[PDB]
Design an enzyme around this catalytic site. Structure first.
Site, mmCIF file in Angstrom:
data_model
loop_
_atom_site.group_PDB
_atom_site.id
_atom_site.type_symbol
_atom_site.label_atom_id
_atom_site.label_comp_id
_atom_site.label_asym_id
_atom_site.label_seq_id
_atom_site.Cartn_x
_atom_site.Cartn_y
_atom_site.Cartn_z
ATOM 1 N N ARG A 1 0.805 -1.221 0.000
ATOM 2 C CA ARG A 1 0.000 0.000 0.000
ATOM 3 C C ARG A 1 0.846 1.284 0.000
ATOM 4 O O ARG A 1 0.296 2.387 -0.011
ATOM 5 C CB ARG A 1 -0.945 0.014 1.200
ATOM 6 C CG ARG A 1 -1.938 -1.132 1.226
ATOM 7 C CD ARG A 1 -3.262 -0.804 0.592
ATOM 8 N NE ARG A 1 -4.332 -1.665 1.090
ATOM 9 C CZ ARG A 1 -5.496 -1.859 0.472
ATOM 10 N NH1 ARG A 1 -5.761 -1.251 -0.679
ATOM 11 N NH2 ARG A 1 -6.401 -2.667 1.011
ATOM 12 N N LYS B 1 8.703 -2.411 2.645
ATOM 13 C CA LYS B 1 7.982 -1.611 3.632
ATOM 14 C C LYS B 1 8.867 -0.791 4.568
ATOM 15 O O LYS B 1 8.661 0.418 4.720
ATOM 16 C CB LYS B 1 7.092 -2.528 4.467
ATOM 17 C CG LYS B 1 5.995 -1.824 5.228
ATOM 18 C CD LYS B 1 5.079 -2.832 5.911
ATOM 19 C CE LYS B 1 3.758 -2.190 6.290
ATOM 20 N NZ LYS B 1 3.094 -2.839 7.456
ATOM 21 N N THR C 1 3.763 -14.043 12.152
ATOM 22 C CA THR C 1 4.756 -13.456 13.041
ATOM 23 C C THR C 1 5.500 -14.494 13.888
ATOM 24 O O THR C 1 6.671 -14.293 14.206
ATOM 25 C CB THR C 1 4.122 -12.382 13.949
ATOM 26 O OG1 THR C 1 2.916 -12.880 14.546
ATOM 27 C CG2 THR C 1 3.672 -11.172 13.127
ATOM 28 N N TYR D 1 8.948 -4.462 15.693
ATOM 29 C CA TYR D 1 8.502 -4.418 14.306
ATOM 30 C C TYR D 1 9.180 -3.280 13.552
ATOM 31 O O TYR D 1 9.244 -2.144 14.033
ATOM 32 C CB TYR D 1 6.969 -4.326 14.252
ATOM 33 C CG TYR D 1 6.349 -5.490 14.992
ATOM 34 C CD1 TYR D 1 5.949 -6.637 14.317
ATOM 35 C CD2 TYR D 1 6.239 -5.473 16.375
ATOM 36 C CE1 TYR D 1 5.422 -7.725 15.003
ATOM 37 C CE2 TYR D 1 5.716 -6.552 17.066
ATOM 38 C CZ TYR D 1 5.311 -7.675 16.379
ATOM 39 O OH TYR D 1 4.788 -8.745 17.076
ATOM 40 N N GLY D 2 9.692 -3.606 12.369
ATOM 41 C CA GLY D 2 10.476 -2.678 11.573
ATOM 42 C C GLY D 2 9.678 -1.497 11.047
ATOM 43 O O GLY D 2 10.267 -0.469 10.691
ATOM 44 N N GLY E 1 -7.202 -7.232 19.426
ATOM 45 C CA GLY E 1 -7.359 -8.211 20.486
ATOM 46 C C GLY E 1 -7.362 -7.583 21.867
ATOM 47 O O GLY E 1 -6.429 -6.857 22.221
ATOM 48 N N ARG F 1 28.746 24.975 -0.597
ATOM 49 C CA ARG F 1 28.823 23.597 -1.050
ATOM 50 C C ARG F 1 29.940 22.877 -0.304
ATOM 51 O O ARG F 1 30.763 23.527 0.327
ATOM 52 C CB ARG F 1 29.091 23.584 -2.542
ATOM 53 C CG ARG F 1 27.917 24.047 -3.371
ATOM 54 C CD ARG F 1 27.788 23.287 -4.670
ATOM 55 N NE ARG F 1 28.626 23.861 -5.693
ATOM 56 C CZ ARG F 1 29.166 23.187 -6.699
ATOM 57 N NH1 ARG F 1 28.980 21.884 -6.830
ATOM 58 N NH2 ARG F 1 29.910 23.831 -7.578
ATOM 59 N N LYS G 1 32.452 26.838 -3.147
ATOM 60 C CA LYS G 1 32.675 25.398 -3.220
ATOM 61 C C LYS G 1 34.129 25.056 -2.942
ATOM 62 O O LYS G 1 35.041 25.643 -3.534
ATOM 63 C CB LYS G 1 32.298 24.865 -4.606
ATOM 64 C CG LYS G 1 32.417 23.347 -4.740
ATOM 65 C CD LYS G 1 32.561 22.911 -6.195
ATOM 66 C CE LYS G 1 33.937 22.354 -6.487
ATOM 67 N NZ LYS G 1 34.131 22.066 -7.951
ATOM 68 N N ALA H 1 38.479 46.269 -11.776
ATOM 69 C CA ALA H 1 37.258 45.680 -12.293
ATOM 70 C C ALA H 1 37.381 45.302 -13.778
ATOM 71 O O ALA H 1 38.026 46.009 -14.560
ATOM 72 C CB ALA H 1 36.112 46.650 -12.091
#
Ligand SMILES: O=c1ccn([C@@H]2O[C@H](CO)[C@@H](O)[C@H]2O)c(=O)[nH]1
Ligand SMILES: O=c1ccn([C@@H]2O[C@H](CO)[C@@H](O)[C@H]2O)c(=O)[nH]1
Ligand SMILES: O=c1ccn([C@@H]2O[C@H](CO)[C@@H](O)[C@H]2O)c(=O)[nH]1
Lengths: 450, 450, 450
Positions: B15, B22, B79, B100-101, B137, B330, B348, B420
């Site tokens: 899903r 997952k 499980t 649980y992952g 449950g 950077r 950079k 310049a």
């Protein structure tokens, strides 16, 4: 009758983990205590007695221009002690309101109700209804009067269910404060002189205390740490945004809008997501502000669109101008009507005349630019290596070719035309065309690394 | 006694509509499963058994440096089956916690309580109270012990009202797991071997199972899709921000702050709205970060202000420096104390010495710049067309005029001055002034299109 | 049977404090009334009768291409009067649904249920359950039928507790509407002809009215002011974002995402915080959008990363391209596969061929650039002072040195190499190297202000 205020502001604010004292931390760009002072002023307070202590030096530098009486409390022996420091200055027949420097959201309108409800020779006490009142002193009403504030550990079963709670803000006349404050003791677990005890003392004197509920809970909320302060901030911004929306300003998402100062606006103003408005800002009719913009101390005329990620400070923009995206106006930028400023352009302390465009990759500083000029991409105003920063004057109807360096001080007269790649150090005359004579070497059959 | 963990991570996550399995989808820049592994490690886990299956190749490449036992489950038969794959590696007398992952918010502190509550030869089961427990449950307590987990379709009227619910996370000793796992069947509607049945099996053996409630519901929440994942993300960021606020960091709006890594900070740090902090970031005292900034793997010294819409990665900034707005650092940008980097500037892999300024429309790459230099607007370090990227060395007290091209490799010695519009290809000596001799054509009486 | 709609849209919207009429204010970039029209169309409406009045001229200019019957109501004498203006155009045996132009969130699915529930010769009335129904007409059910709508001031004690409330949206056949509308009076406190009275009139005729509850309260919510409009906006964006998340788009924070148009997407798309998507946008697989980006009418191919604070409009980007941060694509920007566009770069109406890079401080406009070109920092395409904007053509495998001005119209053929600081006005041939011969003055022993 007359009114004065006392503001308690002596606290160290240990849980802020800061070098500043508690009340100097800002909400919407202004120290918490400044909010309370302003509110006391618009209430009509003749005097404002500021009880300060911790971070005294910083309080003085940060609030130097505030119209307050500086009352230094050398030790924090309780809220009653704090107020008593200012009591010698209370007029017998003036009302006195006690406020807290770390509770900045309290409104004028709530405080007006409180003052109005105060019976002669009595007290008006501001209360608030909490869903979980655990820890707070419960208001005990007998008829329409408060006869006791019962603390957590003293309350019986039914009193624990009372939701109305003491805020500590109250109004009484100066003479009553002087009399009752002298009678407050510190016989309690904390060893402190609590202002709370005035209610018991008033009842001892057969004086009436009347409860006034605050409409909004957040109004009376303090901040002991920066988490609580951030909640106050969010409540404040939401309230500011809601007011603006009800005045007809389209704010795409009020949860993503920040006002830190004052905003004056016309009709049909549209403000996109993540905008910040700082200092004094004035927007005309039909102004559109795109996402990510920051406006600090600016005036924007009618029909101006500011496109995303533009930053403007201390600047004026005339009607029908277009700014952005990625434009920067630094202090002293004055753009006339129908101007255009584009991406990666920085304008500092310069005037730009009607119809003129500066659309890319350009720095203009300390300059005057006339009307209907075309400032090309890559243009830079610069100075010689030396001292102060001199001025570039460009007249009307001037074309400045891309990548031109304008070396101040220099003047370019009306109708002049400057070619791309030029370095201008000498004045250019009216209707003068200046082009650079390049020398190039051309080599045929040059094979690049294939 | 010792402890090891099992993490169930074999799921396809259909899903999510993704090519990834997952548990690899990120929360705060890190795979969900990585959160759970880290938590298992700081719990003191000696071994971490990672049950994986779907997207096996991607699990291996993405988690290659994780200290886990790679347990490949070829088919997801439940499980209990999953945990049984790792059971041969359980030490008889070590505790085992099952996690649980796809439930990454579970905390060390909750899991410590769970482990502490486990009775000898018994089980500690993590439960949670839901307002709408439909589908889950129900925990049945007789005395202080769990005697049954009654599923939705079996519960009577009063059991349906029970809010305490099974999460599936549990602790027991290795020997007990080996024994009970062999006794789990798949006689049920789904045909699966459920770990849940260990509670019934423990009760059959007259072994005690004790319930431990999780303090926070979101802690035990999984994500089956990206909507649920975004809710977990928001809960996580809010919790991170709240911790920082309580440590004394001023965050203007915690709902508009993102931390994706670790943040070390001094006192009186101010972070405006819409900032993102990534990797390892260290901020000194009194650092101010303006709106829209992105900081990834940077060290910022005391008293630095970063103005809005600056992006910094793999960079170091010395004390009292000023960056932004619209600056880009950077990887390898090293700015000394009291430097200035301004709008539309890219730096950079270069060092910039104390007091130096680079304030507009400039690219500096692969360069060393000394102290108290003035790098003008429009300056560019570039290379010849060919191979590798060579270095520009600028000494101390150098003025580089606007729009100068510095063509690497080249060196400019102390005290040099460059006019310049210059192209520098040859080394400039100490105290050498280099100015460009322009040739211009001036034409008088040139009338522009009027 | 057939269906037509009536949309009430004549209101002035005084509390918006705007020059626009009520229904023209936008939600997600589209006039509220446009949402309702679209929904009526996808419902299968054969005719859509738009009752308009205030701001008539603006309604006509703003909705000029809408397929609606323009029914001008000269005076707002009530909702029944409004609908009666369109009644001459109702087909006797078609169903008619009445909708409101200031209630834009109403869904097709709710309206389908409503239409399906309508009994022959009867009415289906859309109702909603409110927690505080004060002020609203209460639905009175006798059996499974509505026999009365009792207003606030008429309801007895038990009727005041009814939470089901009238929305005013309803369906009936055209003949029934014609008959009952002629029987509506204005004998009431407001002196208005209320559509509400159709329920009473239907009951007088022994005709059945059936209630259909709206699933979501916000669905039927109107906006009388911009505060209410902002709440509708936020509800709409959240719903759009949730749909996208459930389709597999990773949105880091759905509360900081805005869609204003349509989004087509592949798998594993990642969209960071504060992104705005406008018009028609198509994203391929594995597209990553960084924080602060604005995409309006763009197509992005597979595997493209757009880094933070990039603004793109009317542009196409091929697979594996890299854009940003701080890039600007203006209309007509077409980037081929594997291109690179970097910070402070503006591209307008230009094609850029495969593998080519434009990485800093550059403006490219009205240009064609071939494959595997290197466009250096500071490069600018410009025109002569005069009329139209001519084209720059750069072939394949061209190196353009930093700070080059390309003066259109001009062509640079395959394999050409241009040195830094060059002004190109003449065509450059295949494999031609062009370098600028600078003249410099060197002065030794120039001491700077120390
Ligand atoms: O002796 C005191 C006691 C309290 N307060 C202030 O009153 C508030 C409520 O106790 C706190 O913020 C505290 O700093 C002081 O200014 N002086
Ligand atoms: O045989 C299984 C059964 C479940 N689980 C995982 O345990 C979680 C709860 O069922 C789910 O995320 C599922 O992927 C697996 O790893 N193996
Ligand atoms: O005579 C009317 C009465 C109402 N409405 C519209 O119907 C809605 C509900 O009263 C309002 O938005 C109002 O503008 C009109 O178009 N015409």
């Amino acid at each position: 009758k007359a009114l004065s205020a006392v503001i308690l502001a002596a606290g160290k604010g240990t849980r802020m983990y800061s070098d500043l004292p508690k009340v100097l931390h800002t909400i919407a760009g202004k120290p918490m205590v400044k909010h309370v002072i302003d509110t006391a002023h618009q209430l009509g307070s003749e005097n404002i007695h500021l009880i300060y202590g911790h971070g005294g030096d910083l309080m003085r530098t940060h609030l130097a221009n505030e119209q307050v009486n500086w009352v230094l409390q050398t030790e924090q022996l309780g809220t009653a002690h704090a107020v008593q420091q200012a009591a010698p200055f209370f007029k017998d027949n003036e009302n006195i309101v006690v406020l807290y420097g770390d509770a900045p959201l309290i409104t004028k309108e709530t405080l007006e109700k409180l003052i109005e409800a105060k019976p002669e020779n009595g007290i008006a006490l501001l209360t608030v209804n909490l869903d979980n009142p655990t820890g707070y002193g419960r208001i005990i009403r007998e008829n329409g009067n408060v006869v006791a504030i019962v603390e957590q550990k003293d309350a019986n079963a039914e009193q624990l269910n009372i939701k109305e709670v003491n805020t500590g803000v109250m109004v009484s006349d100066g003479a009553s404060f002087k009399k009752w404050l002298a009678r407050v003791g510190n016989n309690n677990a904390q060893g402190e002189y609590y202002l709370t005890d005035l209610i018991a003392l008033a009842n001892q004197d057969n004086c009436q205390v009347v409860a006034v509920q605050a409409t909004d809970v957040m109004e009376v909320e303090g901040a002991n740490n920066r988490l609580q302060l951030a909640a106050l901030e969010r409540y404040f911004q939401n309230k500011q945004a809601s007011k603006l929306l009800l005045e007809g300003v389209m704010i795409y998402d009020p949860a993503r809008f920040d006002l830190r100062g004052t905003l004056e606006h016309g009709k049909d103003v549209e403000i996109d997501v993540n905008v910040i408005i700082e200092g004094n800002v004035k927007l005309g009719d039909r102004v559109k502000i795109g996402t990510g913009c920051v406006l600090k101390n600016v005036v924007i005329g009618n029909d101006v669109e500011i496109k995303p990620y533009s930053v403007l400070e201390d600047s004026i923009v005339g009607e029908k101008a277009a700014i952005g995206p990625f434009s920067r106006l630094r202090p002293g930028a004055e753009l006339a009507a129908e101007t255009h400023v584009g991406n990666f352009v920085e304008i500092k302390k310069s005037t730009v005349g009607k119809g003129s465009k500066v659309n890319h990759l350009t720095y203009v500083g300390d300059s005057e630019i006339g009307s209907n000029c075309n400032i090309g991409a890559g243009v830079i105003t610069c100075n010689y290596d030396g001292a102060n920063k001199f001025k570039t004057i460009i007249g009307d109807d001037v074309f400045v070719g891309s990548d031109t360096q304008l070396v101040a001080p220099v003047k370019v007269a009306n109708g002049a035309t400057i070619g791309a790649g030029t370095t201008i150090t000498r004045d250019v005359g009216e209707n003068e065309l200046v082009i650079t004579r390049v020398a190039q070497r051309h080599i045929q059959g040059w094979q690049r690394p294939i």
